[PDB]
Amino acid sequence: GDIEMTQSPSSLSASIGDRLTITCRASQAIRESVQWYQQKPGKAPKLLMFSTSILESGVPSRFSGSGFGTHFTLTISSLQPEDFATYSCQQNYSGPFTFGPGTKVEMRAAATVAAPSVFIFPPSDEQLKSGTASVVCLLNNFYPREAKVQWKVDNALQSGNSQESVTEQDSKDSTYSLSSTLTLSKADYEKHKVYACEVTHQGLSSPVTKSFNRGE
Amino acid sequence: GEVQLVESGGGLVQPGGSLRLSCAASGFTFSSYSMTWVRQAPGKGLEWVSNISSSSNTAFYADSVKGRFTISRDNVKNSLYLQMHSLRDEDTAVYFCARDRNGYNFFDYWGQGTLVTVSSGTASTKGPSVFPLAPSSKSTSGGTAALGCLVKDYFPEPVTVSWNSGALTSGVHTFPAVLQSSGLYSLSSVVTVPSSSLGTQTYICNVNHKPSNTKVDKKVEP
Ligand SMILES: *[C@@H]1O[C@H](CO)[C@@H](O[C@@H]2O[C@H](CO)[C@@H](O[C@@H]3O[C@H](CO[C@H]4O[C@H](CO[C@H]5O[C@H](CO)[C@@H](O)[C@H](O)[C@@H]5O)[C@@H](O)[C@H](O)[C@@H]4O)[C@@H](O)[C@H](O)[C@@H]3O)[C@H](O)[C@H]2NC(C)=O)[C@H](O)[C@H]1NC(C)=O
Numbered sequence A: 001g002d003i004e005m006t007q008s009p010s011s012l013s014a015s016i017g018d019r020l021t022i023t024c025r026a027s028q029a030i031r032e033s034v035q036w037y038q039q040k041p042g043k044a045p046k047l048l049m050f051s052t053s054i055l056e057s058g059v060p061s062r063f064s065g066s067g068f069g070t071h072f073t074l075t076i077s078s079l080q081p082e083d084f085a086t087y088s089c090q091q092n093y094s095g096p097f098t099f100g101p102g103t104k105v106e107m108r109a110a111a112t113v114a115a116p117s118v119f120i121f122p123p124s125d126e127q128l129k130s131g132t133a134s135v136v137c138l139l140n141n142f143y144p145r146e147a148k149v150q151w152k153v154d155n156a157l158q159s160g161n162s163q164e165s166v167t168e169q170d171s172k173d174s175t176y177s178l179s180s181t182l183t184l185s186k187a188d189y190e191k192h193k194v195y196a197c198e199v200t201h202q203g204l205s206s207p208v209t210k211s212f213n214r215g216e
Numbered sequence B: 001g002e003v004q005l006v007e008s009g010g011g012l013v014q015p016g017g018s019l020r021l022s023c024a025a026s027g028f029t030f031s032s033y034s035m036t037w038v039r040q041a042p043g044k045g046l047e048w049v050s051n052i053s054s055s056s057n058t059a060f061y062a063d064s065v066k067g068r069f070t071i072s073r074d075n076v077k078n079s080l081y082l083q084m085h086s087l088r089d090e091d092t093a094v095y096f097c098a099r100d101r102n103g104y105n106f107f108d109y110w111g112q113g114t115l116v117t118v119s120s121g122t123a124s125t126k127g128p129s130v131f132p133l134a135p136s137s138k139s140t141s142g143g144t145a146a147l148g149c150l151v152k153d154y155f156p157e158p159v160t161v162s163w164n165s166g167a168l169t170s171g172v173h174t175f176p177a178v179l180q181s182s183g184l185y186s187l188s189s190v191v192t193v194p195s196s197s198l199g200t201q202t203y204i205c206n207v208n209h210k211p212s213n214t215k216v217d218k219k220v221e222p
């Protein structure tokens, strides 16, 4: 008996300045009882539009909504950097007030190749005192996303002792950043001298190595 | 005052356990509005959980939580509450406090949410250690210097990081958490600043791990 809201597609890529069209379907007719929310990671959901077509106060006029019955549409006339986000519809018509699963609008970046700036951070003295050594390699503001980090300790390729994470794409220049951490026990850390982060990326003609010598 | 909703209380709970969430409202006359709790579980969309009338004279519940959850409000202290009992795996979610615009069951102001983690696994609540990532000759190029904080070995999620109490936002990258083989999370947050600035400016990373009541302000020096 509950009204199911569905959305298509579940994600899409689009370029800044383009017109964007995303749709929301109700499993039953609900007249104009549809809302749109914008969701960005870690941020409060934001009401954009209610009763299908009424802009919430302060929402830019490039946003508009249309539809009736079981088919509804959110339109952005000229996509802006702040518009990359997840959009969810919601019916207030009946019963359990249900939301669509959300459509994520992502960048179709036509962006220049940009090699990462590569930086390396030895363990802090406070961490070493606790018996562990984390070495951090930072790849800053690169495009495209594919980047390979290899850790080398006295030129021996490491495996299994590192983790990495990449940021969300930057909506203003399409770049990514990547943090890789190599973690050793302090005892193991002190058995070696050269700690190196070796980076492969389309923007580099050969791998770049960033290194330090322990305690120098 | 501007309209603000701030949820709190989320953290680790064992299946069958209990947890109470709170939502502090300000910037509007709280007692005039109906209020809702909405949640978002991993792999699911937003889900209406419960609502309460402005006078608290009526309260309704989603079928999945009825008889386990209780919504209530304090119209004098301007707070909304959600008491959860007999918690289940599928109650793991970010929980949002939201204001009903006109009583029409859609919501114009939301909080940023509080994360409830139901776990029968082995990891227990642990606050992070915060270590500096000091700027050096190995983290500078082209007149700019990278520095940061390593936020290691915490559970459950989440950690938030600001810089200089939120006054430093440009050039900040706070990375998504990674899951360690220990079952604990780690993350790092970095910022790029002028190399010329390092002698006069102070850079403090403000780390909040609310599930363990851990709050650390780490000054990062060259
Ligand atoms: C789901 O949500 C819809 C709203 O999206 C609910 O529908 C409303 O239901 C209420 C019932 O109480 C109706 O209230 C009646 O409104 C009469 C006046 O209607 C006219 O004015 C409205 C307000 O206009 C101002 O605000 C709008 C923005 O919303 C501006 O665009 C205008 O320019 C004005 O500034 C108009 O929206 C409306 O179309 C009319 O022109 C009033 O005289 C009555 O006494 C009564 O209060 C309300 O009209 C409905 N609104 C709509 C848009 O349909 C629905 O109930 C919700 N369902 C559930 C289950 O909650």
Ligand SMILES: *[C@@H]1O[C@H](CO)[C@@H](O[C@@H]2O[C@H](CO)[C@@H](O[C@@H]3O[C@H](CO)[C@@H](O)[C@H](O)[C@@H]3O)[C@H](O)[C@H]2NC(C)=O)[C@H](O)[C@H]1NC(C)=O
Residues within 6 Å of the ligand: A095, A096, B034, B051, B052, B053, B058, B060, B100, B103, B104, B105
């Ligand atoms: C909080 O949650 C409850 C539960 O969904 C909401 O109650 C519902 O309110 C709507 C509108 O006020 C009711 O719709 C009406 O139903 C009758 C049929 O009895 C119909 O003839 C009317 O024209 C109208 O459609 C709905 O019945 C009611 N549901 C229940 C179970 O009582 C409530 O609106 C939510 N919000 C607030 C602010 O309380």
